[PDB]
Amino acid sequence: TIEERFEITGTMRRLADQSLPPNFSSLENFRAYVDGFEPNGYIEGKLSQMSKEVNARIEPFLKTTPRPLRLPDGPPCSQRSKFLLMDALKLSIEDPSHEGEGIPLYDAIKCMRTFFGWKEPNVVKPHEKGINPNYLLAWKQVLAELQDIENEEKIPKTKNMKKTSQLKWALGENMAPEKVDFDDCKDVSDLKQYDSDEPELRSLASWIQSEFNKACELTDSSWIELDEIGEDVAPIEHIASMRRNYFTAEVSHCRATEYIMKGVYINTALLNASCAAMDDFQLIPMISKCRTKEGRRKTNLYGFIIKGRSHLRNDTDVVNFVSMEFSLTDPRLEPHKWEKYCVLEIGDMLLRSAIGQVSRPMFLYVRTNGTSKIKMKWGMEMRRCLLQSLQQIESMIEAESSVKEKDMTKEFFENKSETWPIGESPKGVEEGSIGKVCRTLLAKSVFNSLYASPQLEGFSAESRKLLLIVQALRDNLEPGTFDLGGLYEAIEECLINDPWVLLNASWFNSFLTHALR
Amino acid sequence: QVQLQESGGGLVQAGGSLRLSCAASYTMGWFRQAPGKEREFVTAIANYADSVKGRFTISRDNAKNTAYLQMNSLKPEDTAVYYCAGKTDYWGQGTQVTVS
Amino acid sequence: MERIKELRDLMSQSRTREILTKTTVDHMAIIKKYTSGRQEKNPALRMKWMMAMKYPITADKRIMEMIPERNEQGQTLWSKTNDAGSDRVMVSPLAVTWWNRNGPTTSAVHYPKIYKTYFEKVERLKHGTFGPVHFRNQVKIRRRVDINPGHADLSAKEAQDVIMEVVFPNEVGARILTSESQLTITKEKKEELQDCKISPLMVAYMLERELVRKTRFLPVAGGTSSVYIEVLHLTQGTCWEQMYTPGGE
Amino acid sequence: MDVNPTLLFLKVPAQNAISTTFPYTGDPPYSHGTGTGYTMDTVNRTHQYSEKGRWTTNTETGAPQLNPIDGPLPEDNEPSGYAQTDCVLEAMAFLEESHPGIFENSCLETMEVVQQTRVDKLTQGRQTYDWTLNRNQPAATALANTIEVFRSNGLTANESGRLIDFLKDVMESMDKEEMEITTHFKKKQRLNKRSYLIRALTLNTMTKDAERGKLKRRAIATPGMQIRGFVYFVETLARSICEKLEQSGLPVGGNEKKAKLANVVRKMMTNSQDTELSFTITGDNTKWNENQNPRMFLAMITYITRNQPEWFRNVLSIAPIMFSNKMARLGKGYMFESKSMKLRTQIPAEMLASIDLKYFNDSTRKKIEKIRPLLIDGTASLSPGMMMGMFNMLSTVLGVSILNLGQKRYTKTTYWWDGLQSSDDFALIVNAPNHEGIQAGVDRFYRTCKLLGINMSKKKSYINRTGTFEFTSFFYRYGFVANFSMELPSFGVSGINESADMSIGVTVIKNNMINNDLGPATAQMALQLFIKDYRYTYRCHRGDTQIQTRRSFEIKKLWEQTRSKAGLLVSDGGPNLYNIRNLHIPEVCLKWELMDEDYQGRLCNPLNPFVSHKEIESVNNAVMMPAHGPAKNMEYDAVATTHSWIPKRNRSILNTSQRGILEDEQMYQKCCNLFEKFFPSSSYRRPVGISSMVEAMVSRARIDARIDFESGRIKKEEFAEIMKICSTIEELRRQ
RNA sequence: GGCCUGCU
RNA sequence: AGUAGAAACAAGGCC
């Protein structure tokens, strides 16, 4: 026989005497009071005595209640993407190799030799904050070293570049302040905290809207070459395969898929180079392989990326690189969209047109950008945007097919009778077929993955709340709110400078205007 | 449970106007049947078929329990029996519209 | 012979001798889990980051005497630099594939006998017969169902003694199993796995998985049988039902 | 025409397309530097929500503590932590009355568990704040260090192997004049009574990363090892209690949560007749943890443990007693930059008490000025309220008491309410004959909540008619609707190993098909994309391609060597045979009949130097931290192949003064491996006893040599050699 | 210039 | 410069 003894004594007892309500002196007395306590209507007394200003009055939510979300005002919003999306240009070879098949440098050189009309590069639009001559010299250095590879025996799989002052400045080398001890730096007046304040305010511009518009447009190529799956054995598997083939036919010829492949390849190459060649600057040509309507496979070279020192320890540590991309879009028409870019004139292009032949200029967008391990990892998983979008569409199809006891995919994709509101024109709201909805959702997911930021998450949550409230209103469910101004202030604090979140807020305002009728 | 009675059909001039109304005992549709064919979609409540868009307007009064079809700038090709329909299945007997 | 010999070698050095002397059996687990390695918060990010390095995986020292240091072209397969807090050495992923093309071979005939659950799943599916897909709204209602289709009507602790007596007959201690169902299970799984040399721990784990009953709460519509729940993803959907009959029936 | 996805909601209801409103395809927000600012802000906010309380100075720790309990009743809708003892005791009494026998039973099972629990249960935990080194370390490491220090100081009751005895030693340590700790730079340092008290009552603060759904970052806390046993016992009691409450939803999963929500909504609306109106409030509680006073949890537990053995009451009361005096470490510190001299500096947080305020901005300057009075030995007293959901289950109990307090038997009015509470979130279905009744009911519910220190977030809450609501990212619209955007981040390679990643990916696809209503074609697309990413991550391509990688040569020779190439695993560059019908089968078993016997034997060879198994717990369990939720573990079906290797470790310990920890790790692992070879059941069932290693090992050597001669390889020569070698190690242990 | 580490 | 956003990266430490 034995009795378990867990005795509170010593210091730990005194602590127990100091963890009681205000008017108790010992744990013994408080436990005695608790044991002797019985309910005698004490909540009612304090409820009656409590001030009546403590209330949760319900404010009715009507059509005239919700006001449009206010957008921040300031300098126009700039471009944040790691590569050109709407203004990209492609140099091609028409080779039979597959996406991963081949060697990067040789393919890039072969694609670039396919173009004739090179001119000595010159400044067109300066960075406005950097040293454009450094960008010019970097471009000429890249060309020279590309030729140097072309001369020798076998094209190396991966090339390292020289660490000249040009790319030392462009890649931000030896600029991190040296780490020292506080006891040695205390009398320095300039010594203070890191700048920690709300980001700069910027107003929305019309370029992001057009970029999204053309990100949902069809193309003359198939930008997805899917892998293999076990041969379908069940009828449900056949239905799934037919649905999947329909969606692939709809979305493969879409600029969103091209952006997905571009981002995946670029981030994969950048991460692998950073993990392998941590010290030495590395050249990586932007490569993407597609298939033409005729069926011939083709390669495309958008430009080059120079990765710098990438001794990345934390998931937030930044690897800086410099990106160069060919384009034909003149930067003199929307300068505010290219605040952080330096754009040169590098050649002239001749594309067959009925107006003689255009002989357009051909510029080089050069900029210094940066990423991190987390950003690289998440940008190399951009293919789940396809999932998100097509899961939404398949949920739509299944929900509609639960009504009519039959699979409804084929008529949705061919007859195109039913349409959903997927945009507004000055005439009014415009509806498109299911395929256009697929492409629109895919583009939305791709832009979410490209312009991701805390602002996007906060706005998404605090605007989903208001969207649910508005949906309840439209469903005739007598919605009510306790503090709608607080919710509005919570939504409006997420809109600071991100083009994507500001465009989403403008879309939400338009949806409110069209809704509530 | 849902009975439907259409009103407002008749003989009309080409380029004329006509207000159909369907009284009932839910979403509503207007459909038409020409003498040589099966059912043709006209409107639902809003959406309008290509052959009738901009010419015709569908509306409803949920307090009167009535759906209306306001037809304008009528063509000889609108000549049909116009049927009202209710869904969660319920079809009216149809009202004759003859345009000439 | 060997075992007591490395025991004596350990006791030769003062630090390990002190660890062996002062540490009691109960603390076994604690010191065994004593490690400086934090549990990873973002495994995917680092797996995608480590695989870009040379020598990203770890293997026992014995690899240095079964696999050559380099392959035909000279790509290194393993390194002699040990891991952070272990005697294992860091090696390249090629040393895996190499082991699958010229490494030692054995008789894997008994793996089907060990991994009974998975092979039973494969056999059940191979002989299944599908049917037409019917499209109609499915009223998925949430219910508690048993997922394991081979549970022998035993709980975790109830079958743990059976598993020990099957694998570790000497560490059973006081317990001698009374239920005769447990007697027959012990006899069968003893004579069946009498010389299997996969590992005692994996054998025990798979016996626990096979015999112990496990239950989970899932949205189901129809079925409700153990064999019909493992394929619940293939037979029931949002607006479609796929008639299926596993090979067992 | 301008494309606008949001307009899609004009035809598709919001909940039927809510997945579009979840941007879970991009990088989630991360914190970059110190979390000291957030810690100070949280401390100040917790202290100013209870400003009208009464101040005292603890005689043991000497820290200022603020007690708001029984303070003035709130006169505004702002958050308030002035909980009333009598009101909460009455709420618990009504909870008991509506559920007779709940507390007595739960206390009985908790007493059983506490008196049969072992010390090793504390090792099954994530990072904990080791006070021996003043830093976060794995639970097992911190427990071992604390046990070593206790044994060195003379507290050896934990040698009984009982968690209750470990807690007895922990409390006895509180009354010691001078303890001793070890530091490496080894130096023995002496800690007086007060310093050790503060080191045992302190919490370590960090910044929470990968938190999706808010613009601002938050701070979280991790307690020490002295207080985790009491927390374990208290949470065991709270879980046993909540398991008996149908209004709670914290100790269950997601599907159970949905089922209970559907049941409660149907019960509330169906029982309501045509005359009664029904309204659902989708409520979130603002500053949930900052307004929950540990003293009130002490009151709740001492009411729960009435008419129970006094030792049980004491052991369950120790935890809130320590939380009421809890201290919080400010954090990593602050980093300064000087651009004129082009340098950077890192000052630890412990200097915030004395460091001048010229380096700090206005906001941080004011935060430091406000928090300085509470700074004691580099840590701030945080008595008023909990820091980060340590008592989740007790908070859920309080919320369930509030929910049950409106069962129409205590309301004494036509209106009534019910619903479901899961800490920091709730759904409240209130019925009343008229809109005035609903308004009165919600007002009284809010008022009663304010009497218990619980606040309702008016900005994140809204009320509509029943039939449509939200609860923890679950949107109910006449039936729960799948989202699939919460599980999107889990569709990639998990990062465990090749076989584990393959099995986890296929199993995740299967589960999201079963639960989150993932479509067949979408599932096939997910399988294809996952296979592509898997091959591109592990450098294991189909083998018939010309994609040159660091692993494409060996894979290609294995491909050309194999005859039946359809049996090769995707990890070895083989075709993928997976499909919707094969998502529940491991890859090895699906390709078993197609593999060549040579490759099959080479693959699944027990003697492979790659496979390593430590314990029964870590055989086929993978810890995947889900997005928008706490860390979770999953059982994944996999066959132990040569691909089941474990990845490289950090290896950065070599540059730190804590370098001897690796030598101790190696020696401990060598001893553990020797013991396992001596005691094969060491892993599956953790050995128990009070003897020492060498005794068991030598004695079992004796016996096993004996019997393995009585039949086996041993010989008299070898048996006698072993016997006298055992004697040799015996005399060695003597000296 | 030479060598060490990349969640400690 | 750049990334990024309530604090950081733009390699660290050891000789």
JSON list of N, CA and C in Angstrom, two decimals, chain A residues 66-104:
[
{"chain": "A", "resi": 66, "resn": "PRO", "atom": "N", "xyz": [-22.89, 49.30, -48.93]},
{"chain": "A", "resi": 66, "resn": "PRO", "atom": "CA", "xyz": [-21.48, 49.15, -49.28]},
{"chain": "A", "resi": 66, "resn": "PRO", "atom": "C", "xyz": [-21.00, 50.26, -50.21]},
{"chain": "A", "resi": 67, "resn": "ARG", "atom": "N", "xyz": [-19.85, 50.83, -49.89]},
{"chain": "A", "resi": 67, "resn": "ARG", "atom": "CA", "xyz": [-19.21, 51.86, -50.68]},
{"chain": "A", "resi": 67, "resn": "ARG", "atom": "C", "xyz": [-17.99, 51.30, -51.40]},
{"chain": "A", "resi": 68, "resn": "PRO", "atom": "N", "xyz": [-17.62, 51.89, -52.54]},
{"chain": "A", "resi": 68, "resn": "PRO", "atom": "CA", "xyz": [-16.45, 51.38, -53.27]},
{"chain": "A", "resi": 68, "resn": "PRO", "atom": "C", "xyz": [-15.18, 51.50, -52.45]},
{"chain": "A", "resi": 69, "resn": "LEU", "atom": "N", "xyz": [-14.31, 50.50, -52.58]},
{"chain": "A", "resi": 69, "resn": "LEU", "atom": "CA", "xyz": [-13.03, 50.53, -51.88]},
{"chain": "A", "resi": 69, "resn": "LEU", "atom": "C", "xyz": [-12.14, 51.63, -52.45]},
{"chain": "A", "resi": 70, "resn": "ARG", "atom": "N", "xyz": [-11.56, 52.43, -51.57]},
{"chain": "A", "resi": 70, "resn": "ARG", "atom": "CA", "xyz": [-10.68, 53.51, -52.00]},
{"chain": "A", "resi": 70, "resn": "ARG", "atom": "C", "xyz": [-9.30, 52.96, -52.34]},
{"chain": "A", "resi": 71, "resn": "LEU", "atom": "N", "xyz": [-8.76, 53.42, -53.46]},
{"chain": "A", "resi": 71, "resn": "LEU", "atom": "CA", "xyz": [-7.43, 52.99, -53.86]},
{"chain": "A", "resi": 71, "resn": "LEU", "atom": "C", "xyz": [-6.39, 54.05, -53.50]},
{"chain": "A", "resi": 72, "resn": "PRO", "atom": "N", "xyz": [-5.17, 53.66, -53.15]},
{"chain": "A", "resi": 72, "resn": "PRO", "atom": "CA", "xyz": [-4.15, 54.66, -52.80]},
{"chain": "A", "resi": 72, "resn": "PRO", "atom": "C", "xyz": [-3.77, 55.50, -54.01]},
{"chain": "A", "resi": 73, "resn": "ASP", "atom": "N", "xyz": [-3.35, 56.73, -53.72]},
{"chain": "A", "resi": 73, "resn": "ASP", "atom": "CA", "xyz": [-2.93, 57.68, -54.73]},
{"chain": "A", "resi": 73, "resn": "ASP", "atom": "C", "xyz": [-1.44, 57.96, -54.60]},
{"chain": "A", "resi": 74, "resn": "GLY", "atom": "N", "xyz": [-0.79, 58.13, -55.75]},
{"chain": "A", "resi": 74, "resn": "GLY", "atom": "CA", "xyz": [0.64, 58.37, -55.79]},
{"chain": "A", "resi": 74, "resn": "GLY", "atom": "C", "xyz": [1.20, 58.13, -57.17]},
{"chain": "A", "resi": 75, "resn": "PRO", "atom": "N", "xyz": [2.52, 57.98, -57.27]},
{"chain": "A", "resi": 75, "resn": "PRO", "atom": "CA", "xyz": [3.12, 57.70, -58.57]},
{"chain": "A", "resi": 75, "resn": "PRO", "atom": "C", "xyz": [2.61, 56.38, -59.12]},
{"chain": "A", "resi": 76, "resn": "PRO", "atom": "N", "xyz": [2.53, 56.26, -60.44]},
{"chain": "A", "resi": 76, "resn": "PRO", "atom": "CA", "xyz": [1.98, 55.03, -61.03]},
{"chain": "A", "resi": 76, "resn": "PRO", "atom": "C", "xyz": [2.75, 53.79, -60.57]},
{"chain": "A", "resi": 77, "resn": "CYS", "atom": "N", "xyz": [2.08, 52.65, -60.68]},
{"chain": "A", "resi": 77, "resn": "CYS", "atom": "CA", "xyz": [2.67, 51.38, -60.26]},
{"chain": "A", "resi": 77, "resn": "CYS", "atom": "C", "xyz": [3.64, 50.87, -61.33]},
{"chain": "A", "resi": 78, "resn": "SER", "atom": "N", "xyz": [4.73, 50.27, -60.88]},
{"chain": "A", "resi": 78, "resn": "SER", "atom": "CA", "xyz": [5.79, 49.79, -61.75]},
{"chain": "A", "resi": 78, "resn": "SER", "atom": "C", "xyz": [5.70, 48.28, -61.93]},
{"chain": "A", "resi": 79, "resn": "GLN", "atom": "N", "xyz": [6.58, 47.76, -62.78]},
{"chain": "A", "resi": 79, "resn": "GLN", "atom": "CA", "xyz": [6.63, 46.33, -63.06]},
{"chain": "A", "resi": 79, "resn": "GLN", "atom": "C", "xyz": [7.50, 45.63, -62.03]},
{"chain": "A", "resi": 80, "resn": "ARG", "atom": "N", "xyz": [7.03, 44.48, -61.54]},
{"chain": "A", "resi": 80, "resn": "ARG", "atom": "CA", "xyz": [7.75, 43.71, -60.53]},
{"chain": "A", "resi": 80, "resn": "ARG", "atom": "C", "xyz": [8.15, 42.31, -60.97]},
{"chain": "A", "resi": 81, "resn": "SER", "atom": "N", "xyz": [7.66, 41.84, -62.12]},
{"chain": "A", "resi": 81, "resn": "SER", "atom": "CA", "xyz": [7.93, 40.48, -62.55]},
{"chain": "A", "resi": 81, "resn": "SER", "atom": "C", "xyz": [9.42, 40.25, -62.74]},
{"chain": "A", "resi": 82, "resn": "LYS", "atom": "N", "xyz": [9.85, 38.99, -62.67]},
{"chain": "A", "resi": 82, "resn": "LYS", "atom": "CA", "xyz": [11.24, 38.62, -62.90]},
{"chain": "A", "resi": 82, "resn": "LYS", "atom": "C", "xyz": [11.57, 38.45, -64.37]},
{"chain": "A", "resi": 83, "resn": "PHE", "atom": "N", "xyz": [10.59, 38.58, -65.26]},
{"chain": "A", "resi": 83, "resn": "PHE", "atom": "CA", "xyz": [10.82, 38.49, -66.69]},
{"chain": "A", "resi": 83, "resn": "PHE", "atom": "C", "xyz": [9.68, 39.19, -67.41]},
{"chain": "A", "resi": 84, "resn": "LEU", "atom": "N", "xyz": [9.92, 39.54, -68.67]},
{"chain": "A", "resi": 84, "resn": "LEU", "atom": "CA", "xyz": [8.89, 40.16, -69.48]},
{"chain": "A", "resi": 84, "resn": "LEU", "atom": "C", "xyz": [7.78, 39.15, -69.78]},
{"chain": "A", "resi": 85, "resn": "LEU", "atom": "N", "xyz": [6.54, 39.60, -69.65]},
{"chain": "A", "resi": 85, "resn": "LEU", "atom": "CA", "xyz": [5.37, 38.75, -69.88]},
{"chain": "A", "resi": 85, "resn": "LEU", "atom": "C", "xyz": [4.66, 39.11, -71.18]},
{"chain": "A", "resi": 86, "resn": "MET", "atom": "N", "xyz": [4.29, 40.38, -71.35]},
{"chain": "A", "resi": 86, "resn": "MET", "atom": "CA", "xyz": [3.55, 40.81, -72.53]},
{"chain": "A", "resi": 86, "resn": "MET", "atom": "C", "xyz": [4.45, 41.27, -73.67]},
{"chain": "A", "resi": 87, "resn": "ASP", "atom": "N", "xyz": [5.70, 41.65, -73.37]},
{"chain": "A", "resi": 87, "resn": "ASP", "atom": "CA", "xyz": [6.60, 42.24, -74.35]},
{"chain": "A", "resi": 87, "resn": "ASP", "atom": "C", "xyz": [7.77, 41.32, -74.69]},
{"chain": "A", "resi": 88, "resn": "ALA", "atom": "N", "xyz": [7.59, 40.01, -74.51]},
{"chain": "A", "resi": 88, "resn": "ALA", "atom": "CA", "xyz": [8.66, 39.07, -74.79]},
{"chain": "A", "resi": 88, "resn": "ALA", "atom": "C", "xyz": [8.79, 38.84, -76.29]},
{"chain": "A", "resi": 89, "resn": "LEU", "atom": "N", "xyz": [10.00, 38.48, -76.72]},
{"chain": "A", "resi": 89, "resn": "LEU", "atom": "CA", "xyz": [10.28, 38.13, -78.10]},
{"chain": "A", "resi": 89, "resn": "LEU", "atom": "C", "xyz": [11.04, 36.81, -78.12]},
{"chain": "A", "resi": 90, "resn": "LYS", "atom": "N", "xyz": [10.82, 36.04, -79.18]},
{"chain": "A", "resi": 90, "resn": "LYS", "atom": "CA", "xyz": [11.30, 34.66, -79.27]},
{"chain": "A", "resi": 90, "resn": "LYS", "atom": "C", "xyz": [12.17, 34.49, -80.50]},
{"chain": "A", "resi": 91, "resn": "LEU", "atom": "N", "xyz": [13.40, 34.02, -80.31]},
{"chain": "A", "resi": 91, "resn": "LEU", "atom": "CA", "xyz": [14.27, 33.59, -81.39]},
{"chain": "A", "resi": 91, "resn": "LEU", "atom": "C", "xyz": [14.29, 32.07, -81.40]},
{"chain": "A", "resi": 92, "resn": "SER", "atom": "N", "xyz": [14.07, 31.47, -82.57]},
{"chain": "A", "resi": 92, "resn": "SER", "atom": "CA", "xyz": [13.77, 30.05, -82.66]},
{"chain": "A", "resi": 92, "resn": "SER", "atom": "C", "xyz": [14.67, 29.35, -83.66]},
{"chain": "A", "resi": 93, "resn": "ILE", "atom": "N", "xyz": [14.70, 28.03, -83.54]},
{"chain": "A", "resi": 93, "resn": "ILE", "atom": "CA", "xyz": [15.52, 27.19, -84.41]},
{"chain": "A", "resi": 93, "resn": "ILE", "atom": "C", "xyz": [14.73, 26.08, -85.09]},
{"chain": "A", "resi": 94, "resn": "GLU", "atom": "N", "xyz": [13.58, 25.68, -84.55]},
{"chain": "A", "resi": 94, "resn": "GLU", "atom": "CA", "xyz": [12.76, 24.61, -85.14]},
{"chain": "A", "resi": 94, "resn": "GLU", "atom": "C", "xyz": [13.46, 23.25, -85.02]},
{"chain": "A", "resi": 95, "resn": "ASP", "atom": "N", "xyz": [14.05, 22.99, -83.86]},
{"chain": "A", "resi": 95, "resn": "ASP", "atom": "CA", "xyz": [14.73, 21.73, -83.60]},
{"chain": "A", "resi": 95, "resn": "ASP", "atom": "C", "xyz": [13.73, 20.69, -83.10]},
{"chain": "A", "resi": 96, "resn": "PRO", "atom": "N", "xyz": [14.09, 19.41, -83.16]},
{"chain": "A", "resi": 96, "resn": "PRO", "atom": "CA", "xyz": [13.19, 18.35, -82.69]},
{"chain": "A", "resi": 96, "resn": "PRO", "atom": "C", "xyz": [13.36, 17.97, -81.22]},
{"chain": "A", "resi": 97, "resn": "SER", "atom": "N", "xyz": [14.17, 18.69, -80.46]},
{"chain": "A", "resi": 97, "resn": "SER", "atom": "CA", "xyz": [14.43, 18.33, -79.07]},
{"chain": "A", "resi": 97, "resn": "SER", "atom": "C", "xyz": [13.24, 18.66, -78.18]},
{"chain": "A", "resi": 98, "resn": "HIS", "atom": "N", "xyz": [13.15, 17.94, -77.06]},
{"chain": "A", "resi": 98, "resn": "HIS", "atom": "CA", "xyz": [12.09, 18.14, -76.09]},
{"chain": "A", "resi": 98, "resn": "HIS", "atom": "C", "xyz": [12.51, 19.17, -75.05]},
{"chain": "A", "resi": 99, "resn": "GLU", "atom": "N", "xyz": [11.60, 19.48, -74.12]},
{"chain": "A", "resi": 99, "resn": "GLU", "atom": "CA", "xyz": [11.80, 20.57, -73.17]},
{"chain": "A", "resi": 99, "resn": "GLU", "atom": "C", "xyz": [13.15, 20.45, -72.47]},
{"chain": "A", "resi": 100, "resn": "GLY", "atom": "N", "xyz": [13.34, 19.38, -71.69]},
{"chain": "A", "resi": 100, "resn": "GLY", "atom": "CA", "xyz": [14.60, 19.22, -70.98]},
{"chain": "A", "resi": 100, "resn": "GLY", "atom": "C", "xyz": [15.73, 18.73, -71.85]},
{"chain": "A", "resi": 101, "resn": "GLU", "atom": "N", "xyz": [15.41, 18.11, -72.98]},
{"chain": "A", "resi": 101, "resn": "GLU", "atom": "CA", "xyz": [16.43, 17.58, -73.87]},
{"chain": "A", "resi": 101, "resn": "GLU", "atom": "C", "xyz": [17.23, 18.71, -74.50]},
{"chain": "A", "resi": 102, "resn": "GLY", "atom": "N", "xyz": [18.55, 18.56, -74.52]},
{"chain": "A", "resi": 102, "resn": "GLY", "atom": "CA", "xyz": [19.44, 19.49, -75.16]},
{"chain": "A", "resi": 102, "resn": "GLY", "atom": "C", "xyz": [20.41, 20.12, -74.18]},
{"chain": "A", "resi": 103, "resn": "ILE", "atom": "N", "xyz": [21.26, 20.98, -74.71]},
{"chain": "A", "resi": 103, "resn": "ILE", "atom": "CA", "xyz": [22.25, 21.72, -73.94]},
{"chain": "A", "resi": 103, "resn": "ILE", "atom": "C", "xyz": [21.93, 23.21, -74.06]},
{"chain": "A", "resi": 104, "resn": "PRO", "atom": "N", "xyz": [21.88, 23.96, -72.95]},
{"chain": "A", "resi": 104, "resn": "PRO", "atom": "CA", "xyz": [21.36, 25.34, -73.04]},
{"chain": "A", "resi": 104, "resn": "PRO", "atom": "C", "xyz": [22.18, 26.26, -73.93]}
]
